[PDB]
Symmetry: none
Subunit: 168 residues, 4 copies
């Protein structure tokens, strides 16, 4: 069970219970060729994968825009920043600036530890890497600036309960 799997089930749990309306953004593709047979499915015959200009999850919760990225590592001491891309980091900056609720869910998959971290800490650590600093955020930095997410069932990853305390 990957983080993505745990998030798909969590987001569905939340939607089914009326707790929050959060979807994973569909994989982005540029469709070039398609044909349209009379009474059967349109078929894409030529399309390319594009780069996402935005993070992977968004939706609404108590009238607010929620926006996040979710990543997991096998590393035991630090979260590597290679998982993140510049476009995503710049998108997040724009969301925070406009009053969105924006964060990363970070899983240390060998320690069974999941954290919510506000985008501002992530943006900062990314800009330090840009300026030539570390290429991974120390785990104790995440524990201190982020929020442990208890992992159970219904939901598997109860991040909205963290969002409730941190942002409202």
């Amino acid at each position: 069970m990957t983080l993505e799997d745990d998030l798909n089930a969590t987001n569905e749990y939340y939607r089914e219970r009326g707790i929050a309306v959060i979807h994973k953004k569909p994989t982005p593709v540029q469709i070039v060729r398609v044909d349209y047979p009379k009474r059967s499915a349109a078929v894409i015959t030529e399309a390319y994968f594009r780069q996402a200009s935005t993070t992977d999850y968004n939706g609404v919760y108590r009238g607010k825009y929620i926006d996040f990225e979710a990543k997991e590592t096998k590393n035991k001491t630090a979260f590597p920043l290679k998982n993140f891309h510049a476009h995503q980091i710049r998108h997040m900056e724009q969301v925070v600036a406009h009053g969105g609720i924006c964060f990363a869910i970070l899983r240390f998959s060998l320690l069974n530890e999941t954290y919510l971290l506000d985008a501002s800490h992530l943006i900062a650590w990314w800009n330090k890497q840009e300026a030539g600093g570390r290429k991974s955020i120390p785990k104790q930095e995440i524990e201190r600036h982020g929020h442990s997410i208890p992992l159970g069932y219904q939901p598997r990853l109860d991040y909205i309960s963290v969002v409730d305390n941190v942002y409202f």
Copy 2:
């Protein structure tokens, strides 16, 4: 150009100017077949459109979740309700219940007339088809209950100005 083109330019404009962070969602695609060519990039050679479970645009403006659907018609007297799909309408109802700002941008492309119609109106009309009901929204409904969007350049379609007037 198309409403989708004009909205792309408009969303770009708002992002660049620090006005609003709004993006089109990618059409969901079921990939069936990918090929790996001579020098160039990977090509999806067969793929299908999945039914979308949300509306096409979302993001954040002045701290609020903003969500909307954009449709155009060549009809001159009414907006056909078959332009909107069951799953899009359900998403809209859910967004409204969760305190989000949700509306439709409707274009009579033959008339050069674009309106913003709050979701509540689209929900009522669409849901009313059931008991016979109209299969379209008369243009008069859209003029009396909706809001004309001034077309131009920078932005192409200034919906945010109308949103300021309606929802704030």
Copy 3:
């Protein structure tokens, strides 16, 4: 007592005290047969119930149109959606689009608990049934997005104090 009786006493209290002018709509009745006796008043001897085209309560409070459906259940965990009829959910959708204040009063009669739930939530839940959404609103949703109504006397069910806090 029944919710209907408590709402009758409550509305009469609101009218006598100059707070709100709210009335129950009489049950629509197809009259088939009528007897005329000696001294006695005319009697309806055969009649049928019609499908209701609206919700059962409406009126005016502080310049606003107020419209509501009141239902009760003996269920302990969820409110059954079958208690609401298509024509009433339609009506609510239209009232909301027309700028009215529209909600549901939900009583769990075995628990002695009464909640106000805005129409937007009932519309999202009820319309979600269609694809295979559940057939009841979990009480958790009603607790999360609805508003407990104080019960006592003068009035029996003080829903106008909740209306004031939610809509004004």
Copy 4:
């Protein structure tokens, strides 16, 4: 082509076109005995006509409570106040006090002249009758204090267009 007939067709047209949500209150009847046969309609076996405590039509237009009574007279020079009842007048007083839009639709059937008359005037004349005054309002007073509703095609009696001018 009776006033009730014309109002029925008009009210339905308004609903169909998304103009207003206005219905006639159903006939009040006290339901005493009913049978609930096994898989068949419920049958009211004993019931009585009760006195209506409110006026006949109400609903929502543009966020406002609309409430009216519709009466016609064969008299050619005055409208008899006998068509009105104290309890309706008291209800109209309470609607006005609480910010409702309340009026009467008065038709001279032999003249084909229909007037919207604000509840204020009806209340004033009624209370004069009560102090031992005229039991009928001269048609020239209804002309000067009322607002003419011409007969049309769609709808028959376009009272909402008079409502929009008088109250908005």
